[PDB]
Amino acid sequence: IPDAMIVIDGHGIIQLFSTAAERLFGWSELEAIGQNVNILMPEPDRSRHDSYISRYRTTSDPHIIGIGRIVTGKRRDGTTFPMHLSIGEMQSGGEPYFTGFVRDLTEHQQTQARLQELQ
Numbered sequence: 001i002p003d004a005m006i007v008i009d010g011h012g013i014i015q016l017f018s019t020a021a022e023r024l025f026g027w028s029e030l031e032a033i034g035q036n037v038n039i040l041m042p043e044p045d046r047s048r049h050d051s052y053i054s055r056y057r058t059t060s061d062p063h064i065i066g067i068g069r070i071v072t073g074k075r076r077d078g079t080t081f082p083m084h085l086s087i088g089e090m091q092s093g094g095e096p097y098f099t100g101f102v103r104d105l106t107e108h109q110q111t112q113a114r115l116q117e118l119q
Ligand code: HEM
Pocket: 006, 007, 008, 037, 040, 041, 045, 052, 053, 056, 061, 062, 063, 064, 065, 071, 072, 073, 074, 085, 087, 098, 099, 100, 101
């Protein structure tokens, strides 16, 4: 089930960016591949993201890995949107890499908001 998929290294730098992720976030694969993953989210998360990763690497206490969470992401044109995020942990060449699977929930949030406003 291809949804948006992103692989980052232990520093948050993007290694691979699926074509579905390009459609969702507005960045091409080439544009994203050397950027920090924090470019896909707004503040306060953006500036705090590196410490989320560092805190996990030092403690081994997952807050989203193996749990899943609904959050707000940011597209290249500046628009934000709700998405579900799941994180997988992997190893390659001795170093940790993390895989993120994203499911866009904009439609769901809208329908729900629509049903609510019509009482
Ligand atoms: C794009 C919107 C995203 C947002 C808003 C977001 C937000 C967060 C938040 C809020 C935390 C945990 C903070 C906590 O509960 O203390 C976190 C942890 C983490 N995120 Fe992100 N993240 C995003 C995408 C990603 C992606 C795509 C990846 C992997 C490709 C990723 C990799 C990680 C890792 C490895 C951790 C540390 C894990 C642990 O606490 O489980 N994040 N992120």
